[PDB]
C-alpha cells in the first residue's frame, strides 16, 4: 500500500496494549514516543534537541504493531511533541521511499543532493517535516520570520516563498525556511510536488 504526503503520515500503532497516533518519520533515526509507562528494563539516554540534548528513556525489544505489521525494536520515551516512528521501525515493516507519484531504502538516512540557489547541497528526505528547512545560506528575495518546532523546542527561521529547488532531477518550487540547522531537510511541501510516497 502507498501512503501519500499531502497530509501528515499519521498511523495508529499498538504498543503495550494501547492504541496511539504516531507520525511515520523518515527524518528520524529512532522511534520517540510521548511520556507513557512501558513495561521493561530501560536505560537513561540523551538525544537530539533544538537547543541541546533531551533526556529520554530507552526501551529495547518492544513489540509495536504499525499498519498491521509487527515490529519488535527500540522505543524512546520522552518530551517529544508528537509520537515518532523512526527508521529503526520503518525498516522492520519494510517501508521505503519512492517516486510513486527510483526507490530509496531507509537502512540509512535518505540523503539526496539538491540544487537550490542555483547551488548544490545534501538534504534529508523527511516525511515527519511539514516544511523544508535549509541550513544557513543567502537567498534572494523577501523573507518573513517564523518559529518552527521540533524535539527540544523552537528555532527561528526566515520563510522564503516560491523558491525553486531541484531534487534528484525533479523541479520543485515553494516555501523554504532558512535557519540554524545541522541538516538540510526536505519536507512534505516539496516532497509531494516531486511525487514521493511512503510504500510498504
Amino acid at each position: 500500500p502507498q501512503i501519500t504526503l499531502w497530509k501528515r503520515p499519521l498511523v495508529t500503532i499498538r504498543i503495550g496494549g494501547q492504541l496511539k497516533e504516531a507520525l511515520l518519520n523518515t527524518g528520524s533515526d529512532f522511534t520517540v514516543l510521548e511520556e507513557m509507562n512501558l513495561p521493561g528494563k530501560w536505560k537513561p539516554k540523551m538525544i537530539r534537541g533544538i537547543g541541546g540534548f533531551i533526556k529520554v528513556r530507552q526501551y529495547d525489544q518492544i513489540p509495536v504493531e504499525i499498519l498491521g505489521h509487527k515490529a519488535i525494536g527500540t522505543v524512546l520515551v520522552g518530551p517529544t511533541p508528537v509520537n515518532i516512528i523512526g527508521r529503526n521501525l520503518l525498516t522492520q515493516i519494510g517501508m521505503t521511499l519512492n517516486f510513486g507519484g527510483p526507490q530509496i531504502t531507509l537502512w540509512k538516512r535518505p540523503l539526496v543532493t539538491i540544487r537550490i540557489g542555483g547551488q548544490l547541497k545534501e538534504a534529508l528526505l523527511n516525511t515527519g517535516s511539514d516544511d523544508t528547512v535549509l541550513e544557513e545560506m543567502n537567498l534572494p528575495g523577501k523573507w518573513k520570520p517564523k518559529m518552527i518546532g521540533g524535539i527540544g523546542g523552537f528555532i527561528k527561521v526566515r520563510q522564503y516563498d516560491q523558491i525553486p529547488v531541484e531534487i534528484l532531477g525533479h523541479k520543485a518550487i515553494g516555501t523554504v525556511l532558512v535557519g540554524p540547522t545541522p541538516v538540510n531537510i526536505i519536507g512534505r511541501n516539496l516532497l509531494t510536488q516531486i511525487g514521493m510516497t511512503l510504500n510498504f
Binding site: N25, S28, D29, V32, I47, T80, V82, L124, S129
Partner: peptide
C-alpha cells in the same frame, strides 16, 4: 538524530 519540523 530525530529531525522533524512542525
Amino acid at each position: 538524530e530525530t529531525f522533524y519540523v512542525d
